[PDB]
Design a protein around this ligand. Structure first.
Ligand SMILES: Nc1ncnc2c1ncn2[C@@H]1O[C@@H](CO)[C@H](O)[C@@H]1O
Ligand SMILES: Nc1ncnc2c1ncn2[C@@H]1O[C@@H](CO)[C@H](O)[C@@H]1O
Ligand SMILES: Nc1ncnc2c1ncn2[C@@H]1O[C@@H](CO)[C@H](O)[C@@H]1O
Ligand SMILES: Nc1ncnc2c1ncn2[C@@H]1O[C@@H](CO)[C@H](O)[C@@H]1O
Ligand SMILES: [Mg+2]
Ligand SMILES: [Mg+2]
Ligand SMILES: [Mg+2]
Ligand SMILES: [Mg+2]
Lengths: 210, 209, 210, 209
């Protein structure tokens, strides 16, 4: 593929996709005067670059397949310490700080498989300096027996804004009437392909890959 | 920081004056050249290793950068924490191309030497480096005020050296090798990011991942 | 099966099994003048009453079978923190203190299934106050791929005394010409039936059930 | 502490003057008697619960027994740490026998009350106590110079009370109930062990497990 010297032109150089880009400050401004409310965040590639653990999981539990994601031992390790090697995202630092400034209730809603113990809530509160009153234990959402879905949890907790990188984060928000705001998945994530951020006409946060 | 800073089309089209290259263009520039020794930095060149460096910082020096001079950290980093390091696609392509050429592959890292190391095995395994092309990782260390890599480039007759940092490129310059820059990922915990192209060197496109 | 009122007689009351009972002091006296040597301990029901974790494992993973002992999640949990609920044995405190007095090297050799990480070595060193120079990482012995057997390890480490509660601990010692010394398995252990301590003519430590 | 203390056959045959009984004997003594309320202590009576207490001591007060007055400990102990508690065989036999009689089964524990508790669920589950025979655990607490259980035994009209500690037996004595002692296991972390039989009460044989 690729010609050796493909070149370019200035129309291509300056070309922008029609996406509603926003900054943290602009989101904050859009909420000016609104009292404390509930908001939520996806975890993986939204607030934590957790590919280090998923990568190690792939290699360890299914080097020749994709079954690690349904492997209960993987989930034990991933939810009880491998996030010490996850890299918090600066965009999430700024968003979480902004929502703490607002006095908002902060929820983390994940599609990770649940384990009876998890240290992810502690990692999140500690790394993002989340006070107790704003912090809530991580919600493991899904379809399994005993679970409620992501959208059901958004309704139950009256979450008004949901931040995430995956198309299903945005559509979960859409489905319940919440404001879904997209964060860019880092290009060195092992979760591929990358989503088409902005493809629902949703806001996308600038520079949110790191 | 304005709330609404805006932009303009001069800024949108603006290019820094960088000699961008692709792996294919590098390979083309070597057509007909017989096998040679080539070298690679490790951290943010072939591995996204910030997971272990970040863990190390929190564990060994949460308030300082002392961890980087700490042998207890280096033992961890060099004997298993690279299981969390993520191979870069650019390095897969470069190493495949140079192996296909019959080149000798060397790794010259600023990491400090330890009593044992499993990094050489991690690299040969993950990048599918044939035993004949593979060489044990060279742990050159890092001392303020000196390029600790230059001598090793001389020792191994390395003709092209790939790296993300300024000292990788200037080590190449020092010995008259061809220094080629890889972009450090923006989610690296080694900040600030270097200015790729700062010495007029070639910089590989799309090399952050 | 028993009569409602079985009664007894004084021959039965005074009856003793022909067992070579020893105390920690007697063992120490038997080694007097001998320079530092390697000694080894089994873990379960020898130095730790670990039935709490094994019991939780059985209820959790196989209420109606022994499959929990092959369950990889059980072993992850049992070897990486469930021994916080294991009760150190007083006999092992006294034995380990005695071997540290002698300057002996101390080894723990276990047939627990191996996991990539384990916190058992730390729990043992911490609870039994074992100095660094005497302590050695727990050896997971068995016949899984890559492993060597208990007896092979006693030979490799030149272990001269091996303490344990199970028949296989004593015969491992006998097979390599080491001195195998029996600890009583507590009657509330979930590992049943209880072994016949003394069935090989070996020394059995008094009061060693706790 | 002689190296070689020795023994003699008077010592070998010596018996403490204890009214030992079996579950079968207790059952026989109740034959034909209508359903009644009976009660059990929990700790070292029906559950070997030292795993949670030992974990608590280490977590909350490694130097003292201050953790026993710590409501943060009680929350942990009463809402999941009994997953590590080992049901006693004597209690299986006694509870089965009393359920078979149609008796009401109460648990009166010295543990402190908490906001929530899953101990009742653990007991009904482990001992297969039918819903009709089960009653929610009574958390009587423990205060110096008080028998906190006596009034509960009277309140619930408990006619036989099983327990390992002196307060279990004297609580029965206080209200005219039949107090029956179970042996505390020698590997309990609650020491010293009680003198079973110290009030002339029945003591169940082989009841340490
Ligand atoms: N966090 C994750 N969640 C779901 N799938 C993942 C994750 N990380 C990696 N994978 C998947 O495994 C790989 C299989 O191609 C895909 O790239 C996909 O990313
Ligand atoms: N934050 C950091 N600072 C310095 N070096 C780091 C950092 N993270 C990873 N490294 C790696 O450790 C150093 C060893 O010299 C190399 O510079 C390499 O980039
Ligand atoms: N309850 C139990 N049943 C069977 N084995 C046990 C139990 N508790 C400890 N073990 C033993 O401990 C481990 C160490 O050999 C082995 O799996 C062995 O089974
Ligand atoms: N190891 C223990 N130490 C003290 N109390 C315990 C223990 N295990 C259970 N308990 C219960 O908790 C105490 C609360 O008063 C009672 O003494 C009761 O026995
Ligand atoms: Mg995500
Ligand atoms: Mg580098
Ligand atoms: Mg054993
Ligand atoms: Mg009790």
């Amino acid at each position: 593929p690729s010609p050796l010297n493909p070149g370019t032109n200035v129309a291509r150089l300056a070309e922008q996709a029609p996406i509603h880009w926003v900054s943290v400050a602009q989101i904050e401004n859009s909420l000016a005067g609104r009292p404390p409310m509930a908001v939520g965040f996806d975890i993986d590639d939204t607030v934590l670059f957790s590919s280090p653990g998923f990568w190690r999981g792939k290699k360890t539990f299914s080097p020749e397949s994709e079954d690690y994601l349904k492997n209960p031992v993987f989930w034990e390790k991933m939810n009880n310490g491998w996030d010490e090697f996850s890299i918090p995202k600066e965009v999430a630092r700024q968003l979480i700080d902004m929502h703490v400034r607002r006095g908002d209730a902060i929820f983390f809603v994940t599609g990770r498989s649940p384990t009876k113990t998890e240290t992810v809530s502690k990692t999140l509160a500690d790394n993002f300096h989340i006070p107790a009153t704003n912090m809530n234990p991580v919600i493991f959402a899904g379809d399994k027996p005993g679970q409620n879905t992501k959208s059901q949890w958004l309704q139950d907790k009256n979450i008004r804004i949901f931040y995430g990188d995956s198309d299903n984060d945005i559509t979960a928000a859409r489905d319940v009437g919440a404001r879904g705001i997209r964060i860019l998945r880092a290009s060195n994530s092992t979760y591929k392909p990358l989503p088409q951020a902005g493809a629902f006409g949703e806001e996308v946060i600038v520079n949110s890959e790191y």
